[PDB]
C-alpha cells in the first residue's frame with residue numbers, strides 16, 4: 001500500500017496473509033475470508049506454486065512479526081483458479097482457497113459479505129484497500145497491515161488510462177487523479193472493501209496497475225460482483 005496508514009487489531013478481520021514456505025517462508029499475497037473454509041484471492045498469486053502443500057493461511061494477523069514457529073495457521077486443501085485465467089492484466093484474476101479446517105469467527109477473524117443481490121447500481125464512496133505490500137515499486141513487504149481510502153473510477157475513465165489493455169466489465173478500477181495512494185506489489189489478492197449502509201462488501205480483489213500510485217494510472221481490481229455465480233457454484 002502506497003500512502004497508507006497503520007491499521008489496528010481487529011480493524012480488517014476478513015484480511016488474511018497467505019504465506020509460501022518454499023524455498024523460504026514469506027508473505028505471498030493477501031486474501032479475504034468469505035466463508036468458514038473459504039478465502040477469496042487473486043489467481044496471479046499462484047504463479048510457479050508447485051501445489052497447495054507449501055501454502056499457509058494466517059488470519060487475525062496485524063504485524064507480520066507476530067508470526068512465529070508456534071503461530072496457528074490454516075492448511076490449504078485446494079486452490080481453485082478460474083478456468084479462463086491467463087494473466088492478471090487479461091482478467092479472470094480470481095481464485096478460491098478451500099481451507100483444511102473451519103475458521104472459528106472472533107473479533108480478529110470474520111467473513112466479509114460479497115456485493116449483494118440487488119446492489120448492482122450502488123455507487124460506492126467509502127472504499128478501502130489493505131495489505132502488507134510495498135510502499136513503492138522497489139521496496140519490501142511491510143510489517144503492519146496498511147490501509148488507504150481510494151475512490152472508484154468509471155470503467156470508461158480506466159480504459160482511457162490503459163489503452164494497451166482490455167478493461168472489461170469484469171474489472172473495477174480505483175485511484176486518485178494525482179496518484180499518491182494505491183495498492184502495490186504484495187497487496188495482490190487482498191480486498192478492496194466498501195462500506196454501504198454500515199455493512200462492508202468485498203467489491204474488488206487487488207490485481208494489477210502500471211506502477212504504484214502513479215498520476216492517472218489507477219489500480220485495477222477483479223470486479224467481485226461479476227463473479228458471484230462462479231463463487232457460489234465453487235463454494236456449494
Ligand SMILES: CC(C)[C@@H](NS(=O)(=O)c1ccc2c(Cl)cnc(NC(=N)N)c2c1)C(=O)N1CCOCC1
Nearest residue numbers: 088182183184185188208209210211212213218219
Ligand atoms: C502491469 C504489470 C507490468 C505489473 N505492474 S507493476 O507496476 O509492476 C505492479 C505490481 C503489482 C501491483 C499490484 Cl499487486 C497491485 N497494484 C499495482 N499497481 C497499482 N495499483 N497502481 C501493482 C503494480 C503488475 O501490476 N503486476 C501485478 C499482476 O501480476 C503481474 C505484475
